[PDB]
Amino acid sequence: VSLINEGPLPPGWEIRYTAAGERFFVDHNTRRTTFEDPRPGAP
């Protein structure tokens, strides 16, 4: 439950957590990646 029944995921995105203790975002639509959730635009 405690990390498997949390709130809904963002639209058409993936979100991962590295062994360094940091969080990253992944766009399957263009194979792009980023450190945060910025405005839509240039890479």
């Binding site: 590295t18 062994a19 360094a20 940091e22 990253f24 975002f25 992944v26 399957h28 194979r31 990646t33």
Partner: peptide, 15 residues
């Protein structure tokens, strides 16, 4: 944003 870390590579690693 300076500070190199573990690079995120999902689809870009499994291809």
């Amino acid at each position: 944003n300076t500070g190199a870390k573990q690079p995120p590579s999902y689809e870009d690693c499994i291809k």
